[PDB]
Copies of this chain bind each other. A is one copy, B any other.
Amino acid sequence: TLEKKVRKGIESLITELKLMQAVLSKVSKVPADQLDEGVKIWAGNVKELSYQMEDIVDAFMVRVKDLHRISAALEEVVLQAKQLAELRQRYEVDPRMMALYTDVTELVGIEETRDKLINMLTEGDDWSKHPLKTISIVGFGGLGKTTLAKAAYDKIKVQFDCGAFVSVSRNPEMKKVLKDILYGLDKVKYENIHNAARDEKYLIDDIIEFLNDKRYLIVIDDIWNEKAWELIKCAFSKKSPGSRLITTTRNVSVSEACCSSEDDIYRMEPLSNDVSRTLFCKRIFSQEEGCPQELLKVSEEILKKCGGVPLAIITIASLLANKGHIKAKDEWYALLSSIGHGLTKNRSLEQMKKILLFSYYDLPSYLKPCLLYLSIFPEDREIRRARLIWRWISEGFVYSEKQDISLYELGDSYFNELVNRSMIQPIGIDDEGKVKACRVHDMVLDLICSLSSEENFVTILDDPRRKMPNSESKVRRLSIQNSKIDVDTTRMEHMRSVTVFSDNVVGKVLDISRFKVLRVLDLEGCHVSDVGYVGNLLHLRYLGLKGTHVKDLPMEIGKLQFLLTLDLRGTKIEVLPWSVVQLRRLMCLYVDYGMKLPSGIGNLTFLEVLDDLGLSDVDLDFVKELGRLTKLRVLRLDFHGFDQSMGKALEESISNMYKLDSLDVFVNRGLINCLSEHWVPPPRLCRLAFPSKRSWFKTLPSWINPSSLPLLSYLDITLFEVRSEDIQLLGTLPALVYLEIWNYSVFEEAHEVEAPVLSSGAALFPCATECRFIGIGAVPSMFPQGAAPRLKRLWFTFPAKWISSENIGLGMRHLPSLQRVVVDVIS
């Protein structure tokens, strides 16, 4: 009856959504420089309609009284889209080229870095008989990559026969690039080469035939989208000893497509603090620095902001001193406040903003919003990547149709794709084995915040900013920050998300239940426990309550039929309500071992990651129940009171799981009567940790074999005894990037540190960067340096009575950077 017309209109809305998203993606490709203002205004209005109809369709999906409301809203938004239609019909060089021409005696700190680039390629030019090699230089935004290549280039040209710079832009024309290569080789024979119009191929043949019996040193820079470089590499495919190539790029996934060797990849780092200070004082300051003595702290704090990027500091210095330091200690602070939120809205600085937006424009779709989402988080802090992944999934930024992907690995791939585009610095390694958190450069972060605020993507309340938009109704994302004064929340009815950063004003001034529709709720670090209204929120996906003093949670959580996250670390709650099996969709459950889980967990079939499951006073059915739901990828378990044949029951029921990637079991000072020696492990596994040290195994587990579980890269194992064949067996394993073994009896009984030996094989360690042995003697005279090619640190124990022995054959420099080690010695 009435349901049929709305059920029919919904997919019409969906088709319109697809068309609008297509045109929005097309119009956002062009830089906001060639795009006329009329098309841009129309695009903004289209974007607003896009949000409104997404909200209507989502309301329909979650709800199905209300049908009348949905129908009325649908007719209204149709009228709006119609009316917007006829308005539109009714009313209708490279910025970095100059840098290339800069005075040589204007670059500070260049010579040493240039020498490092030269002698990593010309060391084989001595005996220039080696096969040709390419040296790739990587970096982010602009930090000397092209200049350094030219300094090196202009230095070593007497000892070759040819050579040229060629640049490749964002969207090259291959014939143009090839004509540029031909022109630079010889400008006489190929003087009018840009007029000849053959093809992409005959001129490749000509360039090949030209470079026979010659050493040249061709350098190509700014190569993006590796598929473009696979054309040029065919021009360089005949044997030519003593010839070399240089490549510069912002994509670190294209550099390994060159030179096939990680030692040839040149990661280059920002300038050091003192070098950056010297450059900064060379531009503004004439010859001395001892005059101010009052803005020195200001210069320190400014140089900290730019970090090390020769570009940022060059631009800021040019802005700061037009003629004899036209500004002093007041507008310096005004600039400092302006950066972070609004610095770029200025003059002579917009030059560099295009150089930074190059990378943002090169991003494909489905990644522009993911990058723009970073504007939510504050200026300088590490951002846990798991938080970003779950927030992205809950927001709707991640989606697919393949059904062979668990929609989480997809988000991880998006994050890694952001990393390799040289836009966010990854730092640290988490407990799951991947990047822990990420940090974004200060200039880039402030620049993207402005770009996001050009539309209504987010809204930030900041004391330095202290600014509000004119339309309170059209607010979707809010980021409360240190500001705690103007907390008006009246006319934000369709609020997509909200998050609060370390504020005690929350709750007493905030009223969140008033947000009838809400998709994620993030409450890191707050001190509020009054959660009794989340039952009213039915669109919620992400609910973060880490460190929130939440003592208890409402019984009616089961109503939140759509839900994907519950983070409950650091909370005061110790028992979950029974109304949690009622949840049908979930992917993560971050709980601590103290809390007690109600029975019925086996119904949460869609669960993807489980963390810190406490097994205390558990019956057999509950232990067996975890095995029916097989979608886990990460599982963390600890226990105190079930150490019986139930252990073997669980150990067998785990093997039902076929998608694990990590595992770790925690137990106090006991033999592991859980893992049985006749049991198949999951086919896929990477981490397999065991962080307890008071615990031990009697023997090396039998199921540990090179045959099964071939993808391991981490052990953290501990055993009572040790054998000289166990180490050899561990050497049969393929990857095992990380190594750690503990000898329990050594630290607990009167046991002597013996010297195990690898008798069989040659290397048994192709790739193990880290190796740790505690209570086990790993003498470095176990094999010549041709055994473990990559091993940055090694730990072992050396008894003092072996000083007089002859088995201590160290002193030679092994292949990896193994000259830093402090071995624990025992008398």
3 smallest CB-CB distances across A and B, nearest first, come from A101-B234, A23-B91, A85-B90
Q: Within the assembled complex, what's the spacing in Å between the Cα atoms of A196 and B183?
A: 12
Q: Are A87 and B402 in contact (CB under 8 A)?
A: no
Evaluate whether A101 and B327 lie within 8 angstroms (CB atoms) in the complex, with A19-B87, A85-B90 already known: no
Q: Which of B12, B194, B230, B231 contacts A196 (CB 8 A)?
A: B194
Q: Within the assembled complex, what's the spacing in Å between the Cα atoms of A208 and B234?
A: 33
- Output the residue of A92, A97, A198, A327 with the most chain B CB within 10 A: A198
Q: Are A402 and B231 in contact (CB under 8 A)?
A: no
Evaluate whether A101 and B237 lie within 8 angstroms (CB atoms) in the complex, with A90-B85, A196-B194 already known: yes
Whether A20 sits at the interface, judged by CB under 8 Å, is yes
Chain B contacts of A402 at CB under 8 A?
Answer: 342, 345
Q: Within the assembled complex, what's the spacing in Å between the Cα atoms of A209 and B235?
A: 29
| Mask of A178-213 contacts with B, CB within 8 angstroms, 1/0 | 001001000000001011111111101000100000
21 contacts between A and B (CB under 8 A): A12-B87, A19-B87, A19-B90, A20-B91, A46-B91, A85-B86, A85-B90, A93-B174, A93-B200, A93-B231, A97-B201, A98-B230, A101-B235, A183-B198, A183-B202, A192-B195, A192-B196, A194-B197, A327-B711, A330-B683, A342-B404
A413 CB to closest chain B CB, in angstroms? Answer: 11
Chain B contacts of A12 at CB under 8 A?
Answer: 83, 87
Whether A103 sits at the interface, judged by CB under 8 Å, is yes
Q: Within the assembled complex, what's the spacing in Å between the Cα atoms of A200 and B97?
A: 9
Q: Are B198 and A234 in contact (CB under 8 A)?
A: no
Whether A289 sits at the interface, judged by CB under 8 Å, is no
Evaluate whether A15 and B101 lie within 8 angstroms (CB atoms) in the complex, with A93-B200, A192-B196 already known: no
Whether A547 sits at the interface, judged by CB under 8 Å, is no
Q: Are B231 and A98 in contact (CB under 8 A)?
A: yes
Chain B contacts of A100 at CB under 8 A?
Answer: 201
Chain B contacts of A596 at CB under 8 A?
Answer: none
Whether A710 sits at the interface, judged by CB under 8 Å, is yes
Chain B contacts of A824 at CB under 8 A?
Answer: none
Evaluate whether A87 and B15 lie within 8 angstroms (CB atoms) in the complex, with A231-B93, A342-B402 already known: yes
Q: Within the assembled complex, what's the spacing in Å between the Cα atoms of A103 and B239?
A: 10
| Mask of A64-108 contacts with B, CB within 8 angstroms, 1/0 | 000000000000000001011111101111000110110100000
Chain B contacts of A345 at CB under 8 A?
Answer: 402
Whether A16 sits at the interface, judged by CB under 8 Å, is yes
Whether A584 sits at the interface, judged by CB under 8 Å, is no
Q: Within the assembled complex, what's the spacing in Å between the Cα atoms of A97 and B175?
A: 14
Chain B contacts of A197 at CB under 8 A?
Answer: 194-195
Q: Within the assembled complex, what's the spacing in Å between the Cα atoms of A204 and B85?
A: 48
Q: Within the assembled complex, what's the spacing in Å between the Cα atoms of A183 and B202?
A: 9
Whether A282 sits at the interface, judged by CB under 8 Å, is no
Evaluate whether A92 and B23 lie within 8 angstroms (CB atoms) in the complex, with A12-B83, A98-B231 already known: yes
| Mask of A1-29 contacts with B, CB within 8 angstroms, 1/0 | 00000000000100110011011000000
| Mask of A344-372 contacts with B, CB within 8 angstroms, 1/0 | 01000000000000000000000000000
Chain B contacts of A319 at CB under 8 A?
Answer: none
Chain B contacts of A23 at CB under 8 A?
Answer: 91-92
Evaluate whether A91 and B19 lie within 8 angstroms (CB atoms) in the complex, with A183-B198, A183-B202, A194-B197 already known: yes
Evaluate whether A87 and B710 lie within 8 angstroms (CB atoms) in the complex, with A202-B183, A204-B101, A402-B345 already known: no
Whether A648 sits at the interface, judged by CB under 8 Å, is no
A190 CB to closest chain B CB, in angstroms? Answer: 11
Q: Are B327 and A710 in contact (CB under 8 A)?
A: yes
Chain B contacts of A15 at CB under 8 A?
Answer: 84, 87
Q: Within the assembled complex, what's the spacing in Å between the Cα atoms of A195 and B198?
A: 8
Whether A684 sits at the interface, judged by CB under 8 Å, is yes
Whether A328 sits at the interface, judged by CB under 8 Å, is yes
A314 CB to closest chain B CB, in angstroms? Answer: 15
Given A15-B87, A103-B237, A330-B683, output 19 extra A-B contacts at Cβ < 8 Å: A12-B83, A15-B84, A16-B87, A16-B90, A20-B91, A46-B91, A81-B90, A93-B174, A97-B200, A97-B201, A101-B234, A101-B235, A180-B199, A180-B202, A192-B195, A192-B196, A195-B197, A330-B684, A345-B402
Chain B contacts of A196 at CB under 8 A?
Answer: 192, 194-195
Chain B contacts of A328 at CB under 8 A?
Answer: 710
Chain B contacts of A180 at CB under 8 A?
Answer: 199, 202
A768 CB to closest chain B CB, in angstroms? Answer: 16
Chain B contacts of A235 at CB under 8 A?
Answer: 101
Q: Within the assembled complex, what's the spacing in Å between the Cα atoms of A180 and B201?
A: 11
A57 CB to closest chain B CB, in angstroms? Answer: 16
Chain B contacts of A83 at CB under 8 A?
Answer: 12
Interface residues of A in 140-199 (CB under 8 A from B): 174, 180, 183, 192, 194-199
Closest B residue to A101 using CB positions: B234
Chain B contacts of A91 at CB under 8 A?
Answer: 19-20, 22-23, 46
